[PDB]
Amino acid sequence: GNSDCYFGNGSAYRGTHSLTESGASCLPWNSMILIGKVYTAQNPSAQALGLGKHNYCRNPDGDAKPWCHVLKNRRLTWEYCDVPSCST
Ligand SMILES: [Cl-]
Question: 37 alpha carbon to ligand 1 midpoint, in Å?
């Protein structure tokens, strides 16, 4: 149940993992709940960053590993994603 993984900090990762470490599902990068935020789909570099009309894990800001925005009990926060490192 793992079958792609990310190299380095996952900045080049473009798979379809959409769950965080707590088992919550990612919000879409084009969600209306994210108006105000920098790392959405309306970012001018969304294209290059892989932020689009989807809720797949991305690392567009140079963080540790792929992450996404989530809701933890109706609160908007973000979280690292459950993608295995290719180094395990
Ligand atoms: Cl952001």
Answer: 4
According to DSSP, the residues that pair with 85 across neighbouring strands are 6
d(CA 45, CA 2) in angstroms, rounded, equals 28
Give the other-Cβ count within 10 Å of 7's Cβ.
11
Give residue 74 CA to ligand 1 midpoint distance, Å.
Answer: 17
Cα of 35 from ligand 1 centre, angstroms = 10
Tell me which residue has tokens 């908007």.
76
Q: How was this structure determined?
A: X-ray
Q: Where are the beta strands (DSSP E) in the chain?
A: 67-71, 76-80
Q: What are phi and psi of 67, to 5 degrees?
A: -135, 175
Name the fold adopted by 1-88: Plasminogen Kringle 4 (2.40.20)
**Domain parsing of the chain, residue ranges:** 1-88
